[PDB]
């Protein structure tokens, strides 16, 4: 609602750079959402603007009223150069937002391979949990991103994380009927004997006899 929202949203480069070089108050202006020009500039996809802000050394630990750091939000945007500059500065790779989802869940949600390799390369937890007790393989394996699963296999990601209901990534792969992904995770160590609060094995969660061929992938 402020000026830095339209200058940082509607595509103002020289008016915003002149606004920063003219008065630092506009550069450090916060709105009712507890956001700075970095949040709106990452919202509009401004590369050079956040390169100037991160160049001058803007505090990246600035969060909103919920706890959303620009690495969770901009990593939830799936932009290449934005995450290259944020990880170039070295932001908190394992900070907690309102729901607890680390930026790995957001790099895995948007199927961003380079953002996942660069987040997991800088020291991010490959098996971090949110408030819902779920990791990035529940959602990454549930959405249907096989290459994201493979690059999680590059970083030694666990396959038997218990959800808040008790489900595993194999339960979120059989519920979505991901054949090749459930065969891969089962061929990597997914236990077909883990039961959730519904008292149902992954053999009973899958449809069309897929738990029988997953058991075939267990015994063979």
């Amino acid at each position: 609602n402020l000026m830095v929202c339209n200058l940082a949203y509607s595509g103002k480069l020289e008016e915003l750079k002149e606004s920063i070089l003219a008065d630092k108050s506009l550069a450090t202006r916060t709105d009712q959402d507890s956001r700075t020009a970095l949040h709106w500039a990452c919202s509009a996809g401004h590369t050079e603007i956040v390169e100037f802000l991160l160049q001058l050394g803007v505090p990246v630990n600035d969060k909103d009223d919920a706890g959303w750091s620009p690495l969770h939000i901009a990593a939830s945007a799936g932009r290449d150069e934005i995450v290259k500059a944020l990880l170039g500065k070295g932001a908190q790779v394992n900070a907690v937002n309102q729901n607890g989802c680390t930026p790995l869940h957001y790099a895995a949600s948007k199927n961003r391979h380079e953002i996942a390799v660069m987040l997991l390369e800088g020291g991010a937890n490959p098996d971090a949990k949110d408030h819902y007790e779920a990791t990035a393989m529940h959602r990454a394996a549930a959405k249907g991103n096989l290459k994201m699963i493979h690059i999680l296999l590059y970083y030694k990601a666990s396959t038997n994380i218990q959800d808040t209901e008790g489900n595993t990534p194999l339960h979120l792969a059989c519920d979505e009927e991901r054949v090749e992904e459930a065969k891969l995770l089962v061929s990597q160590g997914a236990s077909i004997y883990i039961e959730n609060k519904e008292e149902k094995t992954p053999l009973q969660v899958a449809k069309g006899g897929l738990g029988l061929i997953l058991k075939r992938m267990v015994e063979g």
Binding site: N1, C101, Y132, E176
Partner: protein, 236 residues
């Protein structure tokens, strides 16, 4: 997705618009039953069918022929069936047969019995009109208890599609089709907003997104965020 997939396979394959069916008889069926315990459902499905199949659609409510003249039924099957077999193959949306599928005996409120005797009339008409007709009448409901064995006879309703409670597929793809047109944010995330409906049951997720648009058109915030998604979840 899977429901529109079974309906689509059960509709467009018999309606391939070839004259060779008239020689060897109408083998494939024409009636498809549906389900769905959200807010009466059965609307955005026919909306997507209207997006894909740019043809005629007889949009009628389930309680449209309850007029005291009792002649609206035969006039709609006569005129609508004759313009379907005569003009072009259409999709007649005769939905909500649960209110008109309940047994009734007393002649005081026996209007439902009279219109189910009209359902017997057209029930025999559709048997007499099994050959040489380009008609596709869909008929769905959302209750499996007030049904009668007459409608469940083979050759009339040959498909029985069920609907799951969370049904994460239609939820994810309805989020994709609601975010493909309306505005969105980078903070907007669907992970817990499609995983939580798997744990807790609900309805009208699209209308909940529209409620989030109502809480976002307040002009106090420029871009919708997740607080209106979760707040719209806890309110409605």
């Amino acid at each position: 997705d899977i429901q529109k997939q079974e309906v689509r396979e059960a509709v467009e394959l018999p309606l391939t618009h070839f004259e060779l069916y008239k020689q060897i008889g109408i083998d494939p069926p024409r009636g498809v039953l549906m389900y769905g315990p959200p807010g009466c459902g059965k609307t955005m499905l026919a909306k997507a069918v209207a997006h894909h199949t740019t043809a005629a659609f007889i949009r009628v409510v389930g309680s449209e022929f309850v007029q005291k003249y009792l002649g609206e039924g035969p006039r709609m099957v006569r005129d609508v069936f004759r313009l379907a077999k005569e003009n072009a193959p259409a999709i007649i949306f005769i939905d909500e047969i649960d209110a008109i599928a309940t047994k009734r005996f007393d002649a005081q409120t026996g209007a439902d019995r009279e219109v189910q005797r009209i359902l017997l009339e057209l029930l025999n008409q559709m048997d007499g009109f099994d050959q040489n007709v380009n008609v596709k009448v869909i008929m769905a409901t959302n209750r499996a208890d007030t049904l009668d064995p007459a409608l469940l006879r083979p050759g009339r309703l040959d498909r029985k599609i069920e609907f799951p409670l969370p049904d994460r597929r239609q939820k994810r793809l309805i989020f994709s089709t609601i975010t493909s047109k309306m505005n969105l944010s980078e903070e907007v995330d669907l992970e817990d907003y499609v995983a939580r409906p798997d744990k807790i049951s609900g309805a009208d997720i699209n209308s909940i997104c529209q409620e989030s648009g109502m809480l976002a058109v307040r002009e106090n915030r420029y871009i919708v965020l997740a607080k209106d998604f979760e707040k719209a979840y806890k309110t409605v």
